[PDB]
Subunit: 120 residues, 4 copies
């Protein structure tokens, strides 16, 4: 819809996603050869957003295991899509690593990514 396609964040990463008609998000995420760096993503979005000019709520997850590498971690992005001539997906994210119990307190990093339709 407005979401399906390729998106680029400030870090050099690339997000390719299909938004299904009833709320599914499926795709690949490439962190900053390209194929070693590509990971599955899945998520959900609001397939009927409000009609008052509000953004479209959405989230997705990447677990950082593919056929080549396993970082033993997962990131979730939570945010909203904003359409128009300067379309954005504005997110906050949580990256949790698998840890022992003694290290669990420091298992989760937090940050923010802004995605645009063109590269920075």
């Amino acid at each position: 819809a407005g979401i399906t396609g390729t998106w680029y964040n400030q870090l050099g990463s690339t997000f390719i996603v299909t938004a299904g008609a009833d709320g599914a998000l499926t795709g690949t995420y490439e962190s900053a050869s390209n194929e070693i760096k590509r990971y599955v993503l899945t998520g959900r979005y609001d397939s009927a957003p409000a009609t008052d000019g509000s953004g479209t709520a959405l989230g997705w997850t990447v677990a950082w295991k593919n056929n080549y590498r396993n970082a033993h971690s997962a990131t979730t992005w939570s945010g909203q899509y904003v359409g128009g001539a300067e379309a954005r997906i504005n997110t906050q994210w949580l990256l949790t690593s698998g840890t022992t119990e003694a290290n669990a307190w420091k298992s989760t990093r937090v940050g923010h990514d802004t995605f645009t339709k063109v590269k920075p």
Copy 2:
């Protein structure tokens, strides 16, 4: 990573029913606590991912999932993601932090996202 499929309950009275696929998929349903309302009216689709080959040094299993708060009955114009780890054994837990983003106008975007933490156990 073994150990995730099944029913989980958090401190808020929510129920999380998930299947963990062999290659890292999470699929299932998430139900909010109800008192007056019938259960299925507050049941929502979830999807996510988990580490299907965790380190076998006693570390937890990294995972995450998303609920968009739209179903056939209700739409809150919002989405939550949970990020955390599964810890196995006799008192198994899924320990998470979450981000809840509401769809807002640009002027309200700064206040769009709530943060919290949910601890899931196998008993209510």
Copy 3:
């Protein structure tokens, strides 16, 4: 030092701070007449940062009560100062409102502010 002075974020807010020699931060925060909008801030920073080009860790708190208004809430900013010709204070923040027990789950909002030495 590099921190003391006036800082401006993307939202229209103004942060005026003094960094004391041993780690104190004291000042006023003005959210976007000016005086009704001004609140006390206090915090801490690393008064001896690493010498490898790293930023300077710091945090502060504003409780949103002044002589005129009380929102029954408090924000903390956590971040790092980065000096040089384009100096920044890059932060993530948590805004917690006072709530009943039943509403506590939704008490805390999270976001990010980037502060510069000139207005946006």
Copy 4:
């Protein structure tokens, strides 16, 4: 807002000793859990703010504070802020979420900040 001054303990074995001033100041010390180390080597200055006139409808008292992890003995080149609310009565609590930012190079800034939650009680 009354009720905050004194000693508080979290689930990680840390000790938080704070004075709440009449107009909203928080001042005190924060000590990490120790096993081999002497207590004062892991004790740090804190400052913060709280709502000194909370709503008297059973709501909690909003507050926050900061520790920069430098003392006369050690420097971790980091700072934590806790944001939360004091809840009074017989099982009094300070329920918080926290952000821990490490000083990093620009290339490492994306991974500079950890997030978590601490529950403080009046007993260990």
